Every structure is written in C-alpha cells, then in structure tokens.
Subunit: 466 residues, 4 copies
C-alpha cells in the first residue's frame, strides 16, 4: 500500500494542462526529445528527481540565514560539520552540483597515479558498479575509458534480487589485473546504481570492493546522490543491519571509500548543491589539489558555486533526508507505481529507490536498440497524458569514443523519475492510467533516428525524427 | 473520483505518530476536549481549515515585500485594490482575523440603528441563515439575541438539496415582523453556511434576502470566509450561472450586501488575516465609525493587526483562492471523503465545500444531545487513529443566555475539517479506514458531561468527563 | 560618536522622494495629521518604532518553520519556553499585539478585585509611572480612571536625571491611600516610560514599587515593550548591576511584577506580536480567565492572533533584541541624533532609548498647549524634508473623560521615533539638517484646532485646520 | 551631502562579531599572511570583494520564492531570458552559476571556432582586452591562449585624473592585432568597468571604436558585464552625448558594440549567486548551440546551468533593480566618500571608481619591491589593525609568465577596499578611514612577503606567505 504522507503540505506551485493536439505539435517541435520540452507544457514532470523535489520548513528556514562571505563563511563550516557528523569525513569542498565535483576529482586523481605509479593515460581505465552519464562523460573527456562491472542479475527485469546495484567482485578483480593496477586511477561506487534502476548496493559488497581497492591502492570515490535510499534498503534487506538506524548504516557505509562526490540535489533534497569530500589526512593532498582546481572550475573552495543560504540549507537537508518515516514513505510510493504498472501488464525493473523503470525493450520488441525504443516510449507517454520521462538505454549510453559506433546496451529502460515529496498517490494512479493507453498502442510506436547529434552527452540536446 | 492535484508540492512540514496507549492518556488529560490536545500529538489535524492550509509560491513571495509602515502602508492599498477589483467594495479595513471584524461592526451597527431608528437594545434581534459561533458570541455579548433562519432541508442529512445554506425567506420576513424592523441591527449572510455543513447559498436566495433587507433598511453583512467555494457551487448548480467565472459570480454575489466581514484564513488561503469592507459611500459613516473602533480593538485601520507582508499575501490569496482548477480539486477531495464514509455505512451531511460532517446523532443514537454525542465521537476518532476533529452540535451551540438552559440543536455533527491543500488522497483513505473501527465500536461510546465550563464560547476550553 | 553597525545589511526596501509643493498639498489633505499621510509620501518615517524596524536572519528564518495548528502549536511552546527562560514566567498567552493583551487583562483584573475585595467601579483608579495611550484608553473604556505618578524630574527637559521613568513612590502610596486600596485594580510599570521620553526605570525603584503593591495586594503588570533598553540603562547607570548581563538584569527586573503585557513590536524586533504572561501559580486564575477572554478578542489562546511563524519569530526576537552590542549601537544612534539637535539649538529631553523628543513647548513658545504646538511642529518638519513624526503632548493626552475638557499636559514633545536598525547615521544627519530650517521658521508656525475629533484615542484619526 | 543618504530602508540584518588585536595577530599568521584564508567570523568589515556579498531588495528576495525548479525548459529560465532581451537586446541566453562558469565555456568554443574557420594557430594565438579579470586570464592561459591587456597610458597613473581610465588603447589594440595576426586572435574581451584599472569606466565612444576594429578583422567581441550598471552611470555623468539618457537606454546602446556577453551577476545585478552567457543575434547562433553543448558538461542543462529556479527569478529582477538611478548614485557616492576620506589623511588612491577604493600600496610603501607584494603586506596590516579584510590587485595577483615562469611586471600595486553593495554604512566608511590613520603611521615598518606555498594556477586565492 501507498503509505500516508508523514508530513503536511505547506507550499504549492500551480501547474497547467494541455490538449493532445498541442502535445503532438510540441513533441515534434522538440525533435522527439522530452529534454527540449518547456516546463509549462508538462503536467507531471518525471524527467528527473534531481533538484526538482520539495524541501522541509527547516531547510527553507536555513536558506534565510546564510553567510554570503566569499571566504571562510560560517555557512561553509556548518556544512562541513554536517559532513563530519554524518559521513565521518574530515575534509569538505562544496560544489554547485554533481558534475561540478566530478570535473575536479577526476583530473586530480588521474594526475596523481600518473605522478606516483606511472599510470599511462593512453591505457588507463576506471571502474564502477555503474557510472553516471556525467561521470562517464568527464572520464572520457579526460581520456580515461570506463568499465561498468555490474552483476548478472542487475539488468534482468524478470528476476528479483536484493542488491542489483552490487559490484561484480570477480569481474572487478580480473578487470584490474587485465588493465594493470597502475592504470586504474579510481573506482566509483554509485550508492544506488542509477542505471541498474535505482538498485541498492549491500554493505558487504562495499567492504569486499574496498578491500580489493586497498589491495591495489586504488582511490575509491563514493558517488552519493542517493545514499539515504541505499541505507534504507540495506536496513530492510541485509540481516546484519536490520536494527541499525539510517544514520548508523550511513556512517558504517562510508568507512569503505576514501572520498565522496555527491549531487546533493537528490536525497539531500535541495534544488541545488553538491559535495566533494575526503575521509582523512591520508588524502589531504588530493584535498588541497581539489581546492586549487575548484577555484578554477567552481569558485573559492569555501562556497564552490553555492550561495551561503544554499550551504545552510544543505547542512540541514543531509539530515532531513535520512529520516526513517520519510524514506519508508518515499520508497513505498515508488513501489506503488511499479506494482501498479506491473498489474496492467507493463514489465518493470523491480522497484528501486527513486523511480519506476519501464522495460521498453520488452514492451516494444519490434524496435531495435539502435532505434532507441525507450525514447520512443517517452514521446508516446508525453503525447498521451502530458507526463515527461527519460530513457536509460541506448540513446543515453552513447557511442564508443574509440570506435565511434553505438555502444551495446544491457537494457532499454524508460525511467519514470519521481521528484521527492512532489506528487501524490493520485498522480501515481494518473500515470498508471496513462500507461494503459500507451500499452494499448505499443505495436504502433515507431523507432527514432538522429537529425542532430552532439559530440558529448548527446541525449540532453539531440533531436530525432521518424 | 479524487482529482489529481493541479499543483506540485514545494514545501513540507514533517509530522509525528503516537501509540494508542499514549492517546488514551492524552485525551483524558485534555478533559475529553480535542481543542486542548497538543499539535504534536495529532497525526492528521482536522480541527479546522482556518489558517491551517498551504499557500502558493506567489503568496509566500508576497509575504517578502511588505511595507511595515504604521500608517498608509502601500501594502494596505494593495489589499484595498484587490478588494475593489474582486468584490467591488470601495472601503477596506484590514483586521487580524474574523472575530476581529465582528467585534467592530456589531457594536457600530447596533449603535447606528439605536441613534437612527430608536432600536431597543432590550428587544433587539439579529438574523442570519446561520451565525458562526464567534458571530453569535459577539452578538450576545453586545446584548443582541440571534435567530438562525435556515430552511427545512438544511439539517436533513438523509435528503439531498442544492442549496441547504439558503435563507428561509418566509421565515426571515415573519421574524422581522415579530421582532419589529427597528430592532433588527443587521442580517448576516454566511456564504457557505458553516453549521449547515459547508452548504452553499444560491445567488437567487441572496437577491431575495437583500430585497427584504432593503425593504426594512436593515444593513446586510456578508460573512465571506468561504466565498469562493460558494461561488463554485453556484456555478455548478444554479442554471443561470453555469457559464460564469468564479470572479464574475463573486462580483455579482456581492451586489446583495452592504458590507462584508471575512476571516481570510479560509478560502483566501492565508494563515492569518481578516477583512471588514463597505460597498459604497452610503455606508461611509459606518466605515469611519469602524476606523475609530478598529484603532481600539485591532490597531491603526491601515494594517489593523496585520503585518505589511500579511496584507501583500492576502492581496494575492483572494485571487489564487478563486482559481477554478483549484476549487474543483479541493471540493472534489471533500466529496471523496464523504462518499468514502457513506460507503462504509457512516451517514454524513451531503458533501459541502470544506469538510465532511458525520451525523453523530445517527451514528450514536443511544446518547442524548445533552451529552454531546459528536464530542464523544471526536474523542473516539482521536483515540483510534490520532485524527483530530470538532463537534458542531449541542456542545458548541451553548446555553440560552437568558434561560441558562441548553439550547435545542438541529443536528449533532462531527466535522472532519479539511485544511486546504494540506493532505492527500492517501490521508482521506486513512481517515475512512479509521472510521471503520469507530463505527464498529459505536454502541459502546459513552456520553459526556462538564467538569469545567466557561461562561462564553465554552466549547473551546471546556473540560468534560464521561457518562 | 555614532557607533558602527555591529551587523551587515542583508535586505533593503527602496523608498521615494517628493517635492515641497507636493508635501504642502498632502499635509493639508491629511488634515494636518501625519498619521493620515501615505507611507509612500514619506522619505524617513519616524512615526513610530512599533513594528517598523528590521529583523535578523535568524528571525526571518524562524518565520519559515511555524506550526500553523489552531491549537497546541509547537510554535506556541517555543514562544512559551523563551518567556520562561528570559522572564521566568510560567504562563504565556500570545496576542497579535499590545492593545490585544490590554483589552484582556484590564477587564479581567477589574472584575477580580470587584469579586474579591469589593472594588467599586464608580470609584476605581489605576496607577502607573505613566500609561500608554492605548493602556489609558482601555482603562477608561472600562470605566477606570488613571493616574500617572511620575517624578518631578521626569518632564524637566532642561535637567538631567538617571531614571526619569521612575515611579513617584511617595506619590503612589498617598494616591493609593486617597483612592482606597480596594479600588485599585492594578498598577502598570512601563519599562522605559514612553511619554517621559523613553526614560529608564531603575531596578531599585521597581523593588520599592512592587513592595508597596504587595502591601495592598495590588496586581502589578509590567508593560514590557522596551524592556531591553531599560535593562541597558540599568546596566550603565545603576551601580549594583554594572557587571550584570542584559539577560540577568531582565530576569531580576521581572521578579517585581506579577505579570507582563508586552507589545513585541518594539525591542523584540518583530513587525507583529504581543504577549500576556503571568509569573506563577498564584495567578493561575487570572491566567485561565485571560484564556477565556482571549478566545473572544484575539483567537484561541495558543496563537492568540499570531500565525505559527510569527510565534517562532518572536521566540527568537526576544533573545536577539537583548544582544549587548546591538543595544549599545541602537541607543548610541539615538544619543547621536539628540546631541546633534541640541547642538543646533533645539532643546530635547535627555536621550532615551528609542527616540529623540524635541521640546516643542520651548521651541514654539507662542503657541498655547490647547493649540498643540508639537503637532504643528510635526507638520512643519514634514513639509520641510518629508520626515514624519508624532506628537506626545496635549493632542495625544486627550480630554478628561469626566469633565470633557482638555487635560493639562506636563510637556509638549515632538517624538522623532527611530525604527530599529532601519536608518543610518546619514539619515540622522539628514534629520538634523532638516531641523535647522524648522528652527529658522519657528516663530512663524501657527497653532492648530479640530475640524474632526473622534471620541476615543482621537490623535490617530483626527483632522485639524489653521 | 557627499555621502548621500540611503534611498532605502534596512529590512533584514546579519549580526557580526569583533575580535582583539592579539587574536588577529595569531589569525593572520595562521592564514599564511593571506586574508583569503581567514574565517568570515574573524572579520568585522569584509571588503574582500563585492561579488555575491551585497544585499538584495525585497522584490529579489520575493522572486527567490517563486522559482520553477524544472530540470528543462523552466519558466524561470524564460523569465531571465526575457530580462536579458529587454535590457541588453540579446536574443540568446544561457544561465551559468557564475562568471568563471561562462568563461570556461565561451573561451574553448571561440578558440575552436577561429581554428576551424580561419586556421587559427593555437601555438601563436593571443586574446586582447582593455584588461582581463584574473579568472578570464586564467581560463585563457589554461586553454593555451596568451593574453594582452591594452589599457591607456592614464589607466594606472594614480596621481592623474581621467574620465575613462578603463578605455581600450585603440592604436595599441590595432598594432597588437597586426603583430599577432588577425587569424590568431580568438576574441576581444571588453571589461565594462575595468576592474584592475580600479573600477574605472569605459566610454561608449571607445567601445564603438573598439568594436569597429574588431568587425574589421571579424574578431568576436565578448562584453564582460559584471559591473555594466556602474559603467552606464559614469557614461551618463561624463560623456556629453548621453548626459540625458537613462541607465537603461545607455546600457541598450552600449551592448550594440559586442557580439555576446559573459557576466558574473554577483555584482551589479546584486545577487549572491548567478552568471550569464548570452549572444546578441542569429549570426552567433552557432556559438550559442556550441555553448549549450559545453554547458551540459561544465554547469548543467542549459536552461538552468547551475542555478536553481528561484535564483533565475531573482536574477531576472536584479538586472533591473541594479540599474536604478538613485541607487547607483548612492552606491558610487559612498565609494567616492571613502576615497576622498583616505586621500584626506594622506593615503593616495586611484581616482574613485564604481565598486571600491584602490589604495596605492606602491606609493604608501615605497621600501617594498613589487616582487615582495607590498599591497598584500598592506592588506595584512589593515586586518591586524582593525579587523578589516581586503585584497591586493598587484604583483601577487598578476602571477608569473606561464612561458617564462618569471614574475610578470605590474603597472601598479593596489590594495582594493571592495565595498559590497548596500551592506555597510557611512559610519563603517569612517571606521575604515580611521583604521588607515594607524596603517599609514606604521607604513615604514611593514615588511615584504614571500611564498611558502604557491599553487600553479590562480595562486593568489590559496597561497601562503611569510615576512621576508
Ligand atoms: K533545481
Ligand atoms: K564548472
Ligand atoms: K495559522
Ligand atoms: K508592522
Ligand atoms: K482584538
Ligand atoms: K554569495
């Protein structure tokens, strides 16, 4: 059952509606890419949960007392203190958002292994249970190839597994041995594997992975956008921690990484914000190296592109986002949507933490991956009810930066991303109802093809036809 | 069907849960009166929709640019403009809230007819399709007796009627005759009869009523807390206006009153605010008389107890509260709750605008009105699921200020007041689920009796014990 | 010297200017009463410091997390806790503002002595070192005569005295003897005598006064609008407390009253808010009696006309308003204005806590009190520079509710009320410069007379001619 | 009245703390003699910079409350775009979190453009500006592009007055382009109010001439607009042909002489966070879509580019509020007041500019060689004395030659007392002046500085030094 909101709605933002005819015109005008649609032409925007959710009174209140100092802001220290208490990390660098931190640590870490272990940029490879679109982008832009070492169950939308976000431990080890440990600049642990469908990573898996990393002295970066939801799943599924608090599980979790890069725009519940933090003194050097690069890419390292109030707000969000009643509610809503879709015959990845992932591949078997079936489905859904979603399949995966050919994709998923505390059960029902029509028209949905394709992170602004 | 929210949630306030054992202790410490329970001991607070609902971004934004001047604030003029454009009234006096405006116009209007037509304070009577508790309170405190002239269908929870909030025209006229037109200081038209169950008043009824008032030259005050919902019902039920906008219907509606007193804390959607406005120059005198009394009771008449930002916020709320998609949604949610309760066998007044009114009388037939069955039901509901509600029956009606005996009551209703844009469909379902248990235990609920009773507006702070 | 602001300006509200011709037209349209002028027609609004000052970030932040519950709001408890820790009072009832609390306790206290000691309403008299216009108003409206028992030095603008707000102890005692202790419903101690010119009341004086009250068992109500400034003066002038903190002095001060009525719109620094609190159990009865009357006049006693956020904000203001650096600055600014005026030959009451009181009587000796010289001066000042002020003389004092004749007035003062943290030293200089012209035209300022006079609190909306 | 009275009422304040001399003594040492490393709470009056540290208006704070946090196509984006179209007349808008956010985008894009279109030679490319900001110069050099500031002879003569010291050296610009070869000049940056020159204005005539030269060689012109409003004000007070124009009109005119604008909204637009990268018209549509592609990588989707919805609504309002004439007159008059006060006590400064008083450390501390950063020494002295924090705009900031590796020659050693907008009062100005009385009295005893830790890029922000 969809749990009742453990909160009262305090502030609302009105939204309008549109006609089918209008959407038809609009979706064409947008080159068949929802990313290019106007906000006001969307009734229920499930494009992403990043910076689109609601905030709590405490957070809005925090936003009112920021120290806008350019250097040494007390708001910075407030944020730093929250990081020290929650993750146990001593060094903090705020960034405006996720890719803000990535564009800093990646270059820094690469140069490090180069200068220390003779890493060869022409043969370097980074690993992750699964890289973010932007993490992969910045890695490749820095001449580093990536390899996602996910488990066999990860993308089997027909089978259930407790931690589909887990690292393929053997795979990771053989991968490192092959590539050569000196050529692996870092390993990124994505807490709640986004591409796997917001699937959790067990604490045991993290310990094992970190153990392998320690062995080859490879820096481990914990991508923490949805650390809270991951902590929740660990608490519900990993026996050892059934009776631990989200805070305790989080603290434990972060003992298995050397630093964290986070897009606070998710679980921390803020409309803007990111973090780049190092656990301890052993990484003091990368810390000061990141402060140097931060000045260039984001701003002085005591605000790094965030206004004072934004840091006070984040200092609070990191806590509010860990509330157990909240997490149970949020995740239960997603479960509700997934079960609703599954009951009308729309197969999905098992319910994850932030969104329902519809298996476009299974729903539209006639359109080849090369033709982006999940993107076609997205346009169909929008047409139908004014709901906007994103594809997590071949369109997003991109082409091989070396071959120039379309990368093979493990699954063509349509992601119905649910912004935190933004929509109600009625909206969920509305979405499910919409899919009844989408399904009833599956067989007639046409594949898509480029008319304009950017060279980097193409899915955000590309346009397609047919 | 419960319509999907025509808005996105932007800011939330976390709430806490409790155990049955805890509530059991708490309801006792509160003297069996939910009004005395702590907010944090309530999961879903349906005590009232007054100042407890959500606001829109525009409103929260307006709150940020107020002119805190003590006199002639531009924020005051902003509010005045909204009133002129929406209601067509030229004179505006802000008050912190509803009873703030009542404590001003009532004394003023009474003195007026006294000096003008020789009204006899010892024999004066005021009329209304149905007085709010505070309106009745201030009237009686001023030595004026009240008489609610509602229609026969008003309190028949078993029959459906389009406008149960309507004035009993024949009754109003008869009443004015029996009492003597010189002794009737004013008539209050309560837009959406609260006690009737948030039932609407037709525009035709208002015209007729105002016509009668004009005949005897009796001032007509439009109590406007829920004017928007009333405008909505008119639009859905009164043929002549099916195609009018809420704004147009409102403008039309207010041509049939001489002034308005409003608790902005409802449809205007603000956590604080009230209004006392006069339509035109013919009432300029009561206007300046109200400015004089306002200085004493509320504050300088250009802010009357409201901070600058509060007036800017209200200037916006008056508009946002009239949005058609919004009104349809809000009222549809209430309908959903009422239908849900009715489906599990809990008879209610037909769905009104702001709340579901459960008929405690029908649900608990073994308890005499003198023992406040709706209050007993309220305590039962709280114990069961941590939901807080109010009774609109004998407990609230009070005693006859002259006889000193309990006033006879037309219905014992438990009001599940729904704050605007605060709870979801899931909460509604939660409430319905709770009532399944309440119903199952109906026959065992005891009646209540006083242990402490205030002399005025007793229901707010009184304490009772059972049986 | 004007101290430098111990704070940074964070939010500003733009204001406009006007022409002399325009003001001349406006002042007449307003019936020669500044109270009737539009805010936008005023450059520097010194009408009052009540609810017109600035707030701190913490306060604005508090306003964002209020519990709007109709009953038992946690915001109410927050306010109650602040009252308990600052004043040591156990019972709290919020009111929207000052006169909101007055209209409650006055009726309640009167009925009390009537039912307990046989008070005779037809012969009852209340005392105060000096009643506020609204306190006097509500008293008289309730059929109670008032008597201000101020000291001989109080209104001598030519002589300096440490505590001109003090009670005339002998006077108070004789007064009570004359009237009969059974007919005195209450004594109001106005912390910082407003009419005396924002002059302080010593702690010793309060002890003595409370001692007299205890003797006749007369309830003592501490009017606390400017309790903080009074605490400051005590700290600077009363030897015994030179080394005490504002918080400590306040706590001590409130041991000499049975309850407090406060317009939080002043020292607490909020744009809206008031308080009615009782010290302890011995007054539990008046407390529950006030809860009953509050439901009628203000709202449920757990919010009493204040929104949730307003109570959270006040809970913070009560503290922020007691900051020592702040108080020193605020009071130093007033001192600066007073010294500046005195330097150009404009005699004033010695610098008090919230405003400079110009002695209109001494500045315009040709105008008889009956003609309100301070009001004439106010209109002159406005015409000259667009500065708005209020008179604290015969116009405000009113007529004898019994005789119907104009009450005799101890001083005709023009009050240049300074809103807290709103204007700068440059504005002060601007005000002083304006007075150079006002003085240079003193001899030609005409007296005033009614054209419209309300029956109660006339000065707020009356209109005059000539 | 020289210090004009505030054309506004203070609505919200933030309390600040004081410290003891002994404490500052310890603190300045712990900070490696670099104020940038001091804690905010250890500063009474923070004149480090006016960037994102000033106050906002009610309208702005109100705007912050109604943002559309959509990830794409936010209506708040369109609101910002509309303001840009009305004010600057530019049709294409891309929001960025701040200044360097826009720089890291257009610089790479413009360079690749001339490379692919005119055969630019990265190994011989040079960019020009009346004067590059530290971050603009940084990103240029990081992209392998050398910079050349073509300022006028009067620019850094703190002893002489001149109406537009921020002007381009037209002959110099032309000679420079000829020397380097027009195909190797990727762009020209016009810094509206030359920051390094001392917040000195650039005349509209100078801009027309400069743009004319650029059009001739088909060189893209980027208008760095952080302080466009103050520049518009000076033009209105000093350039005869515009004495009677409004700030809005002068701004509109001004922007006809650039192809695009890069702006750190954290200054004149008055916001604590925000930036803009906009193109004038269709002729630059290509760089526009190229910037959208690079923005996705560096900042975020191009319809918010690192700014939350409310931040864009706030900026849409700030761009307007910042152009108010009474406001500008007041703000600039305050700076004039501080400059005249300092000059009164014998402390020579650059003639009053728009956002700060620039003390000439070189003239105040003649015994210290530029190599030893006299302006930085002066900054530490000022802090010790009264808890006032400032920045140096001299050799320390200028850096080393990325090619030679040697310290770059500097035209002036200035200590910048940056005044955040609507934050401090006249009393604070007087406080600052009073502080300098002591600083001056001790001038002869201030020692020079030297590195103990120096970053390879933008060193002045986090470097640490010690007394030589
Ligand atoms: K956002
Ligand atoms: K960046
Ligand atoms: K409220
Ligand atoms: K106010
Ligand atoms: K009242
Ligand atoms: K900032």
């Amino acid at each position: 059952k969809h749990l009742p909101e453990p909160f009262r709605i305090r502030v609302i933002e009105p939204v309008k509606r549109t006609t089918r005819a209008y959407r038809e015109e609009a979706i064409i005008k947008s080159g068949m890419n929802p990313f290019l649609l106007d906000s006001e032409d969307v009734f229920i925007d499930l494009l992403t949960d990043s910076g689109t959710g609601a905030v709590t009174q405490s957070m809005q209140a925090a936003m009112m007392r920021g120290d806008e100092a350019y250097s040494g802001s007390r708001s910075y220290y407030a944020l730093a203190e929250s990081v020290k208490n929650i993750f146990g990390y001593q060094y903090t660098i705020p960034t405006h958002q996720g890719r803000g931190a990535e564009q800093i640590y990646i270059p820094v870490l690469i140069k490090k292994r180069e200068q220390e272990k003779g890493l060869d940029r022409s043969k370097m490879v980074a690993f992750s249970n699964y890289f973010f679109d932007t993490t992969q982008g910045h890695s490749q832009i820095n001449g580093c190839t990536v390899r996602n070492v996910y488990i066999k169950e990860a993308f089997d939308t027909g089978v259930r597994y407790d931690f589909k976000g887990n690292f393929d431990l053997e795979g990771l080890e053989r991968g490192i041995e092959e590539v050569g440990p000196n050529n692996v600049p870092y390993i990124v642990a994505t807490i709640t594997s986004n591409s796997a469908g917001g699937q959790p990573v067990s604490l045991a898996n993290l310990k094992a992975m970190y153990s392998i990393a320690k062995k080859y002295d490879i820096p481990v970066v914990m991508d923490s956008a949805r650390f809270a939801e991951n902590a929740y799943f660990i608490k519900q599924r990993e026996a050892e921690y059934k009776d631990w608090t989200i805070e305790q599980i989080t603290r434990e979790t972060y003992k298995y990484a050397d630093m964290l890069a986070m897009s606070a725009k998710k679980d921390a519940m803020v409309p803007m914000g990111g973090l780049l933090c190092m656990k301890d003194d052993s990484f003091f050097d990368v810390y000061t190296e990141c402060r140097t690069l931060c000045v260039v890419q984001e701003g002085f390292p005591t605000y790094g592109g965030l206004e004072g109030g934004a840091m006070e707000r984040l200092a609070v969000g990191l806590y509010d986002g860990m509330n157990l009643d909240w997490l149970a509610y949020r995740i239960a809503q997603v479960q509700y949507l997934v079960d609703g879709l599954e009951e009308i015959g729309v197969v999905c990845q098992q319910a994850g933490g932030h969104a329902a992932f519809v298996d476009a591949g299974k729903l539209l078997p006639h359109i080849p991956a090369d033709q982006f079936p999940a993107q076609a489905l997205a346009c169909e859904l929008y047409k139908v009810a004014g709901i906007r979603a994103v594809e997590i399949g071949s369109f997003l995966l991109g082409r091989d930066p070396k071959t120039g050919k379309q990368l093979p994709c493990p699954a063509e998923l349509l992601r119905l991303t649910i912004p935190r505390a933004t929509y109600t059960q009625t909206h969920m029902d509305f979405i499910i109802e919409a899919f009844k029509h989408v399904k009833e028209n599956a067989s007639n949905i046409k594949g898509l093809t480029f008319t304009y394709e950017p060279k980097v992170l193409r899915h955000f602004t590309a346009k397609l036809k047919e």
